[PDB]
Design a protein around this ligand. Structure first.
Ligand code: NI
Length: 341
């Protein structure tokens, strides 16, 4: 059944709740972003109102075939009325089209639902600065102090410098980057820009990227693999067997692969700096795991929460075990005692 942390009290609304059938009492289904664990259940047979960003709405229409009459896109940073209730959509600094949702309840309560987010100090100057938030529905993916990772800018600098050195030393090297969802497009776009290439990919992945409103996208990507020296493959093919196989397919155009796997966190983060990362190598194939995150580090999450000073926190990630729930609740109380709210 639908868990309580997916329901917005005092409303007929749910958030990211499409896999439970008809949720009794729901008049509007919000979708924070186009990742499969969140849209699970949506298809061309859905007949209730879906509220989302413009970009998520493009993906619903083109990839899932949801009918246009049920897609309700909202502009960002704009007060809108939905079924009698004032709401605002804010950029979540996650994947393209991802939003946080501010609900202004008829009784005076204000609720922020972060969806999935990577907290940033820029959020402290959005429309959130302008009133008190009582209840926070929080993306707690990395809510433990071991989870450190570098800025996205540091990670892209590392990837650009590595790829440009390798291809200038060997003009017959191919660069491959893994993907299995939207998000993290800066990794493959920044590398192709330094190399003067388009990125090549499957017809399915090109269609997906053409829904994202990225400026000048026609100048940056292609379905013609032969013209490109940055290829995108499914994340499942980013291993020595998959990559040796791919190299066979390129008809002797290339004699070396340098591949990137943008993971979330991995425990080499507790010891190793970005400057010091090394690849796994077999023969003429090298694979780099780079810690490019689209979720908050522990410290970024803690700063956001201590700034916002909510009255009540409801975690939306890691809620399935008693040990995880107790750990999280201990951090929330630490933060509240340190900052004095
Ligand atoms: Ni996500």
């Amino acid at each position: 059944t639908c868990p309580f942390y997916k329901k917005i009290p005092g409303t007929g609304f749910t958030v990211d709740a499409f896999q439970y059938g008809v949720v009794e009492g729901c008049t509007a289904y919000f979708l924070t972003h186009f990742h499969s664990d969140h849209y699970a259940g949506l298809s061309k047979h859905f007949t209730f109102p879906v509220y989302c960003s413009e970009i998520t709405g493009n993906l619903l229409k083109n990839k899932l075939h949801v009918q246009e009459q049920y897609i309700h896109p909202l502009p960002l940073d704009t007060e809108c009325i939905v079924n009698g209730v004032k709401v605002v959509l804010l950029d979540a600094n996650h994947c393209p089209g991802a939003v946080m949702i501010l609900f202004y309840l008829p009784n005076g309560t204000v609720i922020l639902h972060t969806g999935d987010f990577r907290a940033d100090p820029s959020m402290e100057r959005s429309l959130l600065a302008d009133q008190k938030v009582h209840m926070l529905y929080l993306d707690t993916t990395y809510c433990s102090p071991e989870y450190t990772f570098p800025s996205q800018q540091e990670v892209i600098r590392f990837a650009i410098n590595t790829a440009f050195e390798a291809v200038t030393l060997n003009p017959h090297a191919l660069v491959v980057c893994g993907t299995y969802s939207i998000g993290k497009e800066k990794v493959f776009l920044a590398i192709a820009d330094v190399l003067g290439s388009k990125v090549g990919m499957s017809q399915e992945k090109y269609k997906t990227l053409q829904c994202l409103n990225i400026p000048e996208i026609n100048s940056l990507i292609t379905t013609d693999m032969c013209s490109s020296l940055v290829h995108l493959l499914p994340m499942m093919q980013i291993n020595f067997k998959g990559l040796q196989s791919h190299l066979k397919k390129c008809g002797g155009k290339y004699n070396q692969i340098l591949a990137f796997r943008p993971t979330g966190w991995t425990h080499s983060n507790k010891f190793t700096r970005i400057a010091d990362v090394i690849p796994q190598t077999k023969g003429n194939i090298s694979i780099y795991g780079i810690p490019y995150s689209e979720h908050s580090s522990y410290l970024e999450m803690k700063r956001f929460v201590q700034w916002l000073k909510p009255q009540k926190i409801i975690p939306t990630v890691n809620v399935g075990t008693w040990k995880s729930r107790s750990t999280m609740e201990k951090y929330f109380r630490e933060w509240k005692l340190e900052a004095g709210y």
